[PDB]
């Protein structure tokens, strides 16, 4: 029996432009009197929660609610309480979780990579590689566009960041985009535009025309 | 009251060039006449299984043995057992391990990725990346040897295989070797091999140079 | 009256990705109570042996068996014992065979020749040749492939490695592919595989074009 | 006990320009009384065989015995009988051979490998290969000369005749050279003379040349 806090990230923060928070709760049956509550540092007032997920067959309930906090408050290391009080257990139960403070704030540098003069040889595709590597702070998003316009989710794949291994500490991630050849001869500069904290005005974008490696 | 199986992954296969199984022992009482066996097929015996793990303080033990299995024997799908039998639980428990077969075995499609101009102008490191994509098991082994000689595992960061959704299914990872920029510029031309069970001799190496995307 | 015993090469190693020694005995009449047993170094159980040889028409029988044994195992030089015991010799006699430790292990230097202009005239063959030479160990496994799909050894002739003279000690190799002249033309980038116990990986690739030797 | 009889192959007979076949002893005692005779078709007189080897330390004797015989009568396959007569063996044992006939004679083609571009950059070496390919029989002298005077054999190794394997049956052999680079730019054309029996004028000279692939 344990219940699951999962904390928004900035890159759910900056596709959404609204965080929230969830709380999950498992291996407790689908009841009712499903207690669910979220409260600030000091207790106030949250936005309603709907949406409650489905029964899972192997009896067992898990209770998703969605609450709204401004975005400063949440950097701020701000306490939420996540208090669950059901029927198998009427003692109520506080989940903690706060902003982890103590990362430095480096800025995420881009290079992204280009098609290769060999690739391009068959006349067949193209597949590129948008490498967002040293910066300090867990939590990047990053996304492509096409002549300015968003690309769509099928096209791209975001690793997790993973730590830089020859820095001592310093994460790095990146996004592969696979596209085709001869849109690339004309057009489509594709643009990686990627997100991050650190940044002063929070937002990058790195991108190559067809003279980049003349 | 569980007994976990751990099987060897691919990368711990190669890693080793020797194939071990173990079985770890959860919520069981630090007490003695621990049952550790390991059987075949036709239940035939095994090598001794020694280097135990200590008494943990939460009042449980694992009992973590060792065993050398050979090679075709474990890739046959031949069934091994873990049974234990304990001063809690006389009766004895079989936990039933065996190779999964009937995966598709799509072998790895390699491509070392050279690195960015954009890096190449701070003069301060350059970040080579090995996109080892499209395979359809999901256990990769890469590494990088520098003139032939293997390089040690602090120097370059190797990806979770995490499926690539274009294909139906079929995972992908990546591997980055971060090196200086003045290493890069005279000698080690930072071979990629990439070990995956689905390559028809287990093995596939790529190279890279200065003179590649020139 | 002889027993003999034969190690598994490594070309044999290699083709069938799991070594296994027999014991052929010479000069012993079509009898019955063959004994034949493989003992470890602690004489431990072995996999049962099967299909024992015909009966030779000169009055000789070879009852020769295949066991199944770890890679760690036999190259860590464990003592494998043939004990034989016939009607015509009621005293058992033990062949004793193991791993030959302490060779110097001196890696294949592999290239590739692509063939010469005065054979790329008569347009009726184009003899490719993997020149495999200055390794120390005498046991070199050479195979080729066609676009990663590995080639029939019909169609290749690798030749025993012989002393390279100039060495204090190593032998070399050499193996050729024969191919059809329009065939290499067009595709066929006909990668030559170099196994051998002294590589790191054991497994070394070398390719070749059409558009290399210009 | 057994006796052997080596013939005469044609690098032999090229060599020392007087063909001339062996007889060893095996398995018999260092004994006096040693029977060694040469006869034709006709049983006709021999030349004197002198150097008798010395006695082996294992209880063992081989008396070698070496006769000139005419090119033509060897090649027409007289037979000849080698008598032995030990103090062991009083009753005598003949060994015959004679000339393998029934098979093709098919001139050899040489296709001397050159240099390659990527080898000759390193500026400390050059290897030449010279593949003679497609001689029907298994008898060639292989030698390399420098501008016209022949060049020691602790340079070069001719290997043994092997059937190719997309022919049916046809034998192919090369040699190897190792020479340095500042040498090549200036001399060295490097004539691998052949001599094979079925050429017409008995030998083909194969050569490169600093313009070869230019």
Same mark, same amino acid.
């Given at each position: 029996?344990? =219940?699951?806090?999962?904390?928004?990230?900035?890159?759910?923060?900056?596709?959404?432009?609204?965080?929230?928070?969830?709380?999950?709760?498992?291996?407790?049956?689908?009841?009712?009197?499903?207690?669910?509550?979220?409260?600030?540092?000091?207790?106030?007032?949250?936005?309603?929660?709907?949406?409650?997920?489905?029964?899972?067959?192997?009896?067992?309930?898990?209770?998703?609610?969605?609450?709204?906090?401004?975005?400063?408050?949440?950097?701020?290391?701000?306490?939420? !309480?996540?208090?669950?009080?059901? !029927?198998?257990?009427?003692? +109520?139960?506080?989940?903690?979780?706060?902003?982890?403070?103590?990362?430095?704030? /480096?800025?995420?540098?881009?290079?992204?990579? +280009? +098609?290769?003069?060999?690739?391009?040889?068959?006349?067949?595709?193209?597949?590129?590689?948008?490498? =967002?590597?040293?910066?300090?702070?867990?939590?990047?998003?990053?996304?492509?566009?096409?002549?300015?316009?968003?690309?769509?989710?099928?096209?791209?794949?975001?690793? &997790?960041?993973?730590? #830089?291994?020859? &820095?001592?500490?310093?994460?790095?991630?990146?996004?592969?985009?696979?596209?085709?050849?001869?849109?690339?001869?004309?057009?489509?500069?594709?643009?990686?535009?990627?997100? /991050? #904290?650190?940044?002063?005005?929070?937002?990058?974008?790195?991108? =190559?025309?067809?003279?980049?490696?003349?």
């Amino acid at each position: 029996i344990r =219940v699951f806090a999962i904390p928004p990230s900035f890159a759910s923060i900056f596709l959404t432009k609204s965080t929230k928070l969830t709380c999950l709760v498992t291996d407790l049956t689908t009841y009712d009197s499903v207690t669910i509550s979220w409260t600030r540092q000091n207790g106030e007032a949250v936005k309603t929660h709907t949406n409650i997920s489905e029964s899972h067959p192997n009896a067992t309930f898990s209770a998703v609610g969605e609450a709204s906090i401004c975005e400063d408050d949440w950097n701020s290391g701000e306490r939420f !309480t996540c208090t669950v009080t059901h !029927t198998d257990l009427p003692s +109520p139960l506080k989940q903690t979780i706060s902003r982890p403070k103590g990362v430095a704030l /480096h800025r995420p540098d881009v290079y992204l990579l +280009p +098609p290769a003069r060999e690739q391009l040889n068959l006349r067949e595709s193209a597949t590129i590689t948008c490498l =967002v590597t040293g910066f300090s702070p867990a939590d990047v998003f990053v996304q492509w566009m096409q002549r300015g316009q968003p690309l769509s989710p099928e096209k791209y794949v975001t690793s &997790a960041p993973m730590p #830089e291994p020859q &820095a001592p500490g310093r994460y790095f991630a990146h996004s592969i985009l696979t596209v085709s050849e001869e849109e690339w001869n004309t057009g489509e500069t594709y643009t990686c535009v990627v997100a /991050h #904290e650190a940044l002063p005005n929070r937002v990058t974008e790195r991108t =190559v025309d067809k003279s980049t490696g003349k």
